[PDB]
Design an enzyme around this catalytic site. Structure first.
Site, PDB file in Angstrom:
ATOM      1  N   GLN A   1      45.672 -27.539 -98.189  1.00  0.00           N
ATOM      2  CA  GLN A   1      44.967 -26.676 -97.263  1.00  0.00           C
ATOM      3  C   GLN A   1      44.892 -25.229 -97.730  1.00  0.00           C
ATOM      4  OE1 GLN A   1      48.571 -27.126 -94.058  1.00  0.00           O
ATOM      5  NE2 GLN A   1      46.838 -25.920 -93.348  1.00  0.00           N
TER       6      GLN A   1
ATOM      7  N   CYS B   1      45.449 -27.557 -90.990  1.00  0.00           N
ATOM      8  CA  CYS B   1      46.287 -28.751 -90.915  1.00  0.00           C
ATOM      9  C   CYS B   1      45.664 -29.839 -90.041  1.00  0.00           C
ATOM     10  CB  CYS B   1      47.703 -28.380 -90.449  1.00  0.00           C
ATOM     11  SG  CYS B   1      47.762 -27.376 -88.916  1.00  0.00           S
TER      12      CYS B   1
ATOM     13  N   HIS C   1      52.620 -27.868 -86.969  1.00  0.00           N
ATOM     14  CA  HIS C   1      51.931 -28.397 -88.143  1.00  0.00           C
ATOM     15  C   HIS C   1      51.460 -29.843 -87.927  1.00  0.00           C
ATOM     16  CE1 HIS C   1      50.841 -28.731 -92.333  1.00  0.00           C
ATOM     17  NE2 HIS C   1      51.850 -29.520 -92.647  1.00  0.00           N
TER      18      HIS C   1
ATOM     19  N   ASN D   1      51.465 -35.016 -96.313  1.00  0.00           N
ATOM     20  CA  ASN D   1      51.258 -33.598 -96.048  1.00  0.00           C
ATOM     21  C   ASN D   1      50.046 -33.042 -96.802  1.00  0.00           C
ATOM     22  OD1 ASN D   1      51.738 -31.129 -94.832  1.00  0.00           O
ATOM     23  ND2 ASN D   1      53.519 -30.607 -96.082  1.00  0.00           N
TER      24      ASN D   1
HETATM   25  C1  LIG Z   1      48.033 -25.624 -89.267  1.00  0.00           C
HETATM   26  O1  LIG Z   1      47.114 -25.505 -90.014  1.00  0.00           O
HETATM   27  N1  LIG Z   1      47.757 -24.689 -88.059  1.00  0.00           N
HETATM   28  N2  LIG Z   1      48.379 -25.072 -86.728  1.00  0.00           N
HETATM   29  C2  LIG Z   1      47.656 -25.731 -85.763  1.00  0.00           C
HETATM   30  O2  LIG Z   1      46.483 -26.047 -85.957  1.00  0.00           O
HETATM   31  C3  LIG Z   1      48.318 -26.062 -84.408  1.00  0.00           C
HETATM   32  C4  LIG Z   1      49.164 -27.344 -84.471  1.00  0.00           C
HETATM   33  C5  LIG Z   1      48.549 -28.751 -84.409  1.00  0.00           C
HETATM   34  C6  LIG Z   1      47.365 -28.904 -85.334  1.00  0.00           C
HETATM   35  C7  LIG Z   1      48.202 -29.195 -83.010  1.00  0.00           C
HETATM   36  N3  LIG Z   1      47.329 -26.153 -83.330  1.00  0.00           N
HETATM   37  C8  LIG Z   1      47.427 -25.431 -82.212  1.00  0.00           C
HETATM   38  O3  LIG Z   1      48.345 -24.639 -82.008  1.00  0.00           O
HETATM   39  O4  LIG Z   1      46.394 -25.627 -81.253  1.00  0.00           O
HETATM   40  C9  LIG Z   1      45.331 -24.662 -80.950  1.00  0.00           C
HETATM   41  C10 LIG Z   1      45.905 -23.268 -80.986  1.00  0.00           C
HETATM   42  C11 LIG Z   1      45.732 -22.463 -82.114  1.00  0.00           C
HETATM   43  C12 LIG Z   1      46.322 -21.202 -82.190  1.00  0.00           C
HETATM   44  C13 LIG Z   1      47.081 -20.733 -81.140  1.00  0.00           C
HETATM   45  C14 LIG Z   1      47.262 -21.524 -79.994  1.00  0.00           C
HETATM   46  C15 LIG Z   1      46.671 -22.783 -79.921  1.00  0.00           C
HETATM   47  C16 LIG Z   1      49.060 -25.084 -90.402  1.00  0.00           C
HETATM   48  C17 LIG Z   1      50.321 -25.506 -90.679  1.00  0.00           C
HETATM   49  S1  LIG Z   1      51.091 -24.801 -92.095  1.00  0.00           S
HETATM   50  C18 LIG Z   1      49.676 -23.859 -92.342  1.00  0.00           C
HETATM   51  C19 LIG Z   1      49.614 -22.831 -93.562  1.00  0.00           C
HETATM   52  C20 LIG Z   1      48.780 -21.573 -93.237  1.00  0.00           C
HETATM   53  C21 LIG Z   1      49.318 -20.175 -93.598  1.00  0.00           C
HETATM   54  C22 LIG Z   1      48.151 -19.196 -93.885  1.00  0.00           C
HETATM   55  C23 LIG Z   1      50.332 -20.188 -94.759  1.00  0.00           C
HETATM   56  N4  LIG Z   1      49.146 -23.441 -94.813  1.00  0.00           N
HETATM   57  C24 LIG Z   1      49.950 -23.565 -95.875  1.00  0.00           C
HETATM   58  O5  LIG Z   1      51.135 -23.166 -95.881  1.00  0.00           O
HETATM   59  O6  LIG Z   1      49.362 -24.201 -97.013  1.00  0.00           O
HETATM   60  C25 LIG Z   1      49.583 -23.841 -98.390  1.00  0.00           C
HETATM   61  C26 LIG Z   1      50.947 -24.135 -98.948  1.00  0.00           C
HETATM   62  C27 LIG Z   1      51.097 -24.997-100.031  1.00  0.00           C
HETATM   63  C28 LIG Z   1      52.367 -25.265-100.564  1.00  0.00           C
HETATM   64  C29 LIG Z   1      53.503 -24.663-100.003  1.00  0.00           C
HETATM   65  C30 LIG Z   1      53.359 -23.798 -98.918  1.00  0.00           C
HETATM   66  C31 LIG Z   1      52.084 -23.540 -98.399  1.00  0.00           C
HETATM   67  N5  LIG Z   1      48.739 -24.141 -91.371  1.00  0.00           N
END
Ligand SMILES: *[C@@](=O)([N][N]C(=O)[C]([C][C]([C])[C])[N]C(=O)O[C]C1=[C][C]=[C][C]=[C]1)C1=[C]SC([C]([C][C]([C])[C])[N]C(=O)O[C]C2=[C][C]=[C][C]=[C]2)=N1
Length: 215
Positions: free
Chosen positions: A19, A25, A162, A182
């Site tokens: 991603q 996610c 997540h 993942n």
């Molecule tokens: C995930 O992408 N975002 N979270 C959600 O979508 C949540 C939880 C689930 C999907 C129900 N949804 C949610 O809260 O509902 C609607 C809402 C939205 C906002 C507020 C309130 C309500 C996610 C998980 S980890 C992640 C990161 C992004 C960040 C910019 C760092 N991506 C990431 O880490 O990927 C690269 C990577 C690769 C290797 C190692 C570490 C990182 N986004």
């Protein structure tokens, strides 16, 4: 249901995606669910478009989070979703650019698993295929996972942050688990995978928000 099943060995799972720096996610998790159903019904296995979802589902926030159910319902109403090829991943929100010519699948609604019910979740994986689940992946242990059946008592089942994909279940040395796919790249965890504790008082909220598309 089998006491063990691996959809990866069934050819239901596409390669591990990444991603990047975008909270997509939910999209990857939904695409993964759709992918399994597409495989089951047509026998074809191709990569779907998480970007189609990121840019087009008005109920979700794109890179700011979202829900699988919204993404599924969107696909039902839109009557389709493009293939990865016709709508490649860029990792940034942009205007909905859905191309009907690239449509690779569609779905006719979704079903949710009883919240908190792991038994319900297992039965679904066994007879339906991969299932989209939401978990707590905020722990340093998780980020640095590498071997064995993951578990951490500090993991909060009410901090679902997540969305991931449940591609199976089994048991490793008397330790039941869920085979989790993942979207943090192939170089994370075990080839982009993680075995998470199963039947251990809903580890990290594994069964709090499980759902799946219907075709
Ligand atoms: C995930 O992408 N975002 N979270 C959600 O979508 C949540 C939880 C689930 C999907 C129900 N949804 C949610 O809260 O509902 C609607 C809402 C939205 C906002 C507020 C309130 C309500 C996610 C998980 S980890 C992640 C990161 C992004 C960040 C910019 C760092 N991506 C990431 O880490 O990927 C690269 C990577 C690769 C290797 C190692 C570490 C990182 N986004």
């Amino acid at each position: 249901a089998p006491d063990s099943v691996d959809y990866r060995k069934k050819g239901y799972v596409t390669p591990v995606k990444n991603q990047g720096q975008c909270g997509s996610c939910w999209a990857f998790s939904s695409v993964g669910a759709l992918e399994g159903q597409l495989k089951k019904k047509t026998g074809k296995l191709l990569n779907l478009s998480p970007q189609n979802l990121v840019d087009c589902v008005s109920e979700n926030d794109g890179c700011g989070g979202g829900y699988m159910t919204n993404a599924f319902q969107y696909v039902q109403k839109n009557r389709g979703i493009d293939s990865e090829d016709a709508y490649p991943y860029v990792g940034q929100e942009e205007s909905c650019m859905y191309n009907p010519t690239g449509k690779a699948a569609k779905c006719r609604g979704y079903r949710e698993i009883p919240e908190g019910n792991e038994k319900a979740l297992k039965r679904a994986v066994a007879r339906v295929g991969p299932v989209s689940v939401a978990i707590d992946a905020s722990l340093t242990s998780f980020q640095f996972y590498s071997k064995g059946v993951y578990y951490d008592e500090s993991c909060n089942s009410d901090n679902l942050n997540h969305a991931v994909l449940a591609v199976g279940y089994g048991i490793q040395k008397g330790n039941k688990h869920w085979i989790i796919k993942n979207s943090w790249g192939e170089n994370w965890g075990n080839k982009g995978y993680i075995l998470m504790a199963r039947n251990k008082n809903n580890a990290c909220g594994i069964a709090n928000l499980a759902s799946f598309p219907k075709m």
